[PDB]
């Protein structure tokens, strides 16, 4: 009755008179009391007050009715409990008027509604705003500062920060304070233009600490871990290196310029939480992480590719080239043993046995904790093989040769992993890898379906007179031989009819013809842009992976023998590790304000 | 890439003409919107995401997004 | 400018079929030939007309060959102004009535529209996804 007549006129606004005469009839009514002007004053269906139904009905009379609906809820003393107050509704749990002023871009009403009194740390939790399927719903942090923030609103941000009132780190129900949201929203730079990152700075300018960093979400991560887990890259390459220019802020800079003297400098990186000295470093999660489907501009970045560089100079390629003498070795002395088949088998068979049962360990323990993957899960069954035929050596069999020279075989198809460690030779075996995976295994099917269909075409009239073409095997096989220029054309004979038996056996010709002439052209469609772009990405990414395998299998001591970067004195006593790195800029000249060693060393 | 689209497509459009007059009712791509005083059609509801373009959304038809 | 001066008459019939059956927007969906041909003048004054009469008779009626202005788009290869047509969003309260996209769910980056499928979801005698598979030419 008169509830919604008010509501409706909040909603359309097309007269604050009107309004008034029924909050005149509201207030002549009050003679029967703030628990039912509430209630008078709210829908209760899904706890929303008219305050919420102006707000989400914006037109330009609202910024009156809001005046008049705050003058008139501090006039009767309800001014409160009334702004606070916050929806029933399970999906829409938490939203206040202040989520509705940021989420329609009112600037001024927000400000007016703080000012009376809102609530800045309203959490907003509900299925909307705790989306667990994606494309349904959006996810910014569920506090007003981070629903600001995400959505590009800097000025309100602001104001936010001002009040002393504001938590700024403040977690959420999922954990994550403000700035692992703003990790959370960083798609990519076309589709944003990095205005996320211009927030990232402005809220740690706005409070210098390093708490917000250090805090983690119940996942346990830290936001440059979450934006490692993630695949955010363009906000993890301003992370990972920030040069802060305030003397007073700049202790919260993770990279430090100590040397310049003129356009050669040398900037100090921060390896804290970077170079696999943790639980789980940056340089762990962007390897490990199968999901991310982006790490070919993650292992880029300026800290993280030298120290791949440095480890493999120093530690991996000493490693992997004694792995792969000792496989060489031992795949000879499998050769000469096989080729052969006493006093010498005891010398080298006792060491095949061991290193096939070590091979076999490793790969075992490894292949229960996961086209990245095929290499490990065929040495293996190498090494199955050869332990196979060992036995069946003592044993009284035939069938061991068998195995045996599979085995052999099968090493000398397994070496081509280690060519993947060479500099050249590793994008041609990636190229193999890629090349074998999805060109050539559509062209094979669609030729064993061509080669059984005129198999038993051909062993259907051949066999007319039991022959050159007999059974079914024997003309596959008879067709294999021909693909190739084998298998001598015969005149049909003991056939049915030669004429049908000349013209199927063309059309297999020509049909064979023309599909490896598809596979070639697929193929020179693939080569140009992607193929290569693509075979230097893996290549990249495969160093990495053996680069943090190595690392790993090392001793406890040794580790930290190596131990990459230097304890560099920064602001008072950071004390942390760090790496250096010499750079040359011509294109820009500046006097140099900031600099941590006066006498470049 | 366009032969195939096409192919799909007219597919599609063949296999849609052989189901049963039920059927096809009892598939009935859309739902029936309230719009203006009634409009009463069917419609296709597709979520979009837009970060280029900020502004405050005047002309909406639902208050409460579901 | 005269295009409005002619709307503006009252003896101006805006409806009026001519001999080959088509109204005005028949016509208009006649000619548009390219962007980088035409500029897209075209697509600018099938809006102005429809605002300037709001209805839904111009799309309704039909040509000698028994079509809809979207159809006639749609039979001939006429590919920017039907993705136009196909979906519109008017801003005007008044003459809202007229879009065939609405957004009923904006919230802020996230936004839900709502296509119509009136005559294009094959629930009809021809729709435009009939036609635009099933045509050749």
Redesign the interface.
């Known amino acids: 009755r008169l509830k919604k007549r008010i509501f409706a006129a909040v909603s359309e606004g097309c007269v604050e008179e009107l309004v008034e005469l029924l909050v005149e009839l509201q207030e002549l009514c009050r003679r029967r009391v703030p628990d039912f002007l509430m209630h008078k004053l709210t829908a209760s269906d899904?706890g929303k007050t008219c305050l919420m139904?102006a707000l989400?009905?914006?037109?330009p009379n609202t910024k009156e009715i809001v005046r008049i609906l705050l003058a008139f809820a501090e006039e009767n003393d309800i001014l409160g409990r009334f702004i606070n107050a916050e929806y029933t509704?399970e999906?829409?749990e938490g939203q206040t008027a202040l989520n509705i002023a940021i989420?329609?871009?009112?600037g001024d009403i927000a400000a007016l509604l703080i000012a009376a009194g809102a609530d800045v740390n309203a959490h907003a939790k509900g299925a909307?705003f705790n989306p667990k399927y994606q494309?349904?719903?959006?996810y910014?942090g569920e506090t007003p500062l981070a629903l600001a923030a995400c959505?590009?609103q800097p000025e309100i941000v602001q104001l936010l920060m001002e009040h002393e009132q504001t938590d700024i780190t403040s977690r959420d129900s999922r954990g994550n304070n403000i700035l692992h949201a703003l990790v959370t929203v960083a798609?990519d730079f076309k589709?944003?233009?990095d205005f996320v990152k211009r927030m990232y700075d402005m809220i740690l300018l706005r409070s210098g600490n390093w708490e917000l960093e250090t805090t983690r979400n119940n996942d346990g991560l830290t936001p440059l871990q979450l934006a490692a887990k993630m695949g955010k890259a363009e906000i993890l390459k301003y992370i990972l290196s920030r040069e802060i220019k305030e003397k007073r802020l700049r202790s919260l800079s993770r990279k430090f310029t100590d040397w310049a003297y003129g356009p050669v400098s040398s900037s100090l990186y921060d390896l804290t939480n970077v170079d696999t000295t943790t639980d789980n470093s940056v340089l762990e999660i962007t390897v490990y992480n199968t999901n991310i489907d982006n790490r070919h501009e993650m292992l880029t970045l300026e800290p993280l590719h030298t120290l791949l560089h440095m480890k493999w100079k120093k530690f991996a390629k000493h490693m992997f080239f004694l792995s792969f003498c000792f496989y060489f070795f031992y795949n000879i002395t499998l050769t000469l043993v096989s080729y052969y088949r006493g006093w010498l088998q005891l010398l080298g068979r006792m060491f095949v046995l061991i290193w096939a049962m070590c091979i076999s360990v490793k790969e075992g323990i490894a292949i229960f904790l996961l086209s990245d993957a095929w290499f490990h899960f065929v040495f293996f069954i190498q090494a199955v093989l050869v332990i196979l035929s060992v036995f069946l050596y003592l044993f009284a069999y035939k069938e061991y040769l068998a195995c045996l020279v599979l085995a052999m075989a099968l090493g000398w198809a397994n070496m081509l992993y280690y060519t993947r460690g060479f500099q050249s030779m590793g994008m041609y075996s990636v190229m193999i890898q890629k090349v074998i995976l999805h060109d050539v295994l559509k062209f094979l099917f669609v030729y064993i379906v061509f080669l059984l269909g005129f198999g038993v075409a051909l062993a259907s009239l051949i066999e007319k007179c039991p022959s050159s073409y007999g059974s079914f095997s024997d003309a596959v096989l008879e067709l294999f031989k021909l693909t190739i220029g084998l298998g001598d054309l015969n005149i049909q004979q003991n056939s049915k009819y030669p004429i049908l038996f000349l013209f199927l056996l063309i059309t297999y010709v020509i049909l064979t013809f023309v599909l490896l002439l598809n596979m070639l052209i697929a193929l020179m469609g693939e080569t140009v842009e992607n193929v290569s772009k693509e075979s230097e990405r893996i290549w990249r990414l495969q160093r990495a992976r053996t680069i943090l395998e190595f690392e790993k299998m090392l001793p406890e001591w040794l580790r930290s023998r190596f131990r990459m970067g230097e304890l560099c004195k920064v602001a008072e006593d950071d004390f942390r590790l760090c790496l250096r790195i010499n750079e040359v800029k011509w294109t820009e000249w500046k006097t140099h304000v900031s600099f941590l060693n006066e006498d470049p060393g």
């Open positions: 899904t139904k989400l009905n914006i037109n509704e999906a829409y989420e329609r871009r009112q909307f494309h349904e719903g959006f910014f959505t590009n798609e589709t944003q233009n």
